[PDB]
Amino acid sequence: GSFTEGWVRFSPGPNAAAYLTLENPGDLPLRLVGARTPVAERVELHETFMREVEGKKVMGMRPVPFLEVPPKGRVELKPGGYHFMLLGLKRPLKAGEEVELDLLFAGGKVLKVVLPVEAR
């Protein structure tokens, strides 16, 4: 919550999670449609919601078709909110290394980042 700040939360498998602060320096908007990583096979952008059922508020996660960001704008993939779900962990994971990550955007854009391995 100041610059491009993110991390990947590991597991022994079959699934895991990844997060970041994300922002647009351009004069047209960004639309973030996924990511891509060496530590997982399946990877998906999800939300976390509040939603009513019995009139009472219930909370949980689900995939979204995308996220997006206005020009000169910013968002954060907060764990109580938007994030990546990971499935089929194609590497075993050891704490205190990094995950190379390709953030996927609508059309011919992908933006490469590198972010640390949290164990949790």
| Closest alpha carbon to 89 in 43, 39, 44 | 39
33 contacts 111 by C-beta, under 8 angstroms: no
* 1 lies in some domain: no
Angle (nearest 5°) at CA 113 between 69 and 37? 100
Alpha carbons 56 and 54: distance in angstroms, whole number = 5
Alpha carbons 77 and 7: distance in angstroms, whole number = 10
The residues facing 20 across adjacent strands are 6
At which residue do the structure tokens 């602060």 appear? 21
Query: Can you give the CATH number for the domain in which 113 is found?
Result: 2.60.40.1890
What are 76's two structure tokens? 């954060």
* First-to-last C-alpha distance (Å) of the chain: 21
Alpha carbons 67 and 32: distance in angstroms, whole number = 5
* 18 lies in some domain: yes
70 lies in which domain range? 6-119
What are 54's two structure tokens? 């019995």
Peptide bond into 12 cis (omega under 30): no
- The count of domains in the chain is 1
Q: β-strand 109-118 against 6-9: which pairing, if any?
A: parallel
